[PDB]
Design a protein around this ligand. Structure first.
Ligand SMILES: C=CCc1ccc(O)c(OC)c1
Length: 119
């Protein structure tokens, strides 16, 4: 996947997931910029939708290190990808919707979805 292809893919998922969840565009823009309101229901649903569509969360809401590696290896150095994988593997949440927003918040510390547009 190229950067330009990832840019297009992120825009597609952001649009599909906004329609599917009913999240307000400004709230979706906050998520894209890495400002995640983890406790907000629509933010949780939007985060879940994006992570599932990128194969980062499986049907059982288990974090898939290979899914995040496939995206992040295009954006950050190899040692930062390994750090992100170990860091975000520590998120343990019985509520799968809260798990999804906590995961997007974790990934956002390394690179935001918005950051890809300036590449
Ligand atoms: C990994 C796919 C979606 C995604 C979620 C949160 C992010 O911060 C991100 O940055 C590139 C990408």
């Amino acid at each position: 996947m190229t950067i330009e292809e990832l840019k297009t893919r992120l825009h597609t998922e952001q649009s599909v997931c906004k329609t599917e969840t009913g999240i307000d565009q400004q709230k979706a823009n906050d998520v894209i910029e890495g400002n995640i309101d983890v406790e907000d229901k629509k933010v949780q649903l939007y985060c879940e939708c994006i992570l599932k569509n990128f194969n980062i969360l499986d049907k059982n809401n288990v974090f898939k290190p290979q899914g995040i590696k496939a995206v992040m290896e295009l954006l950050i150095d190899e040692n930062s990808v390994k750090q992100l994988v170990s860091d975000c593997s520590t998120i343990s949440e019985e509520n799968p919707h809260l798990k999804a927003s906590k995961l997007v918040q974790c990934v956002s510390k390394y690179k935001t979805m918005k950051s890809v547009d300036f590449l």
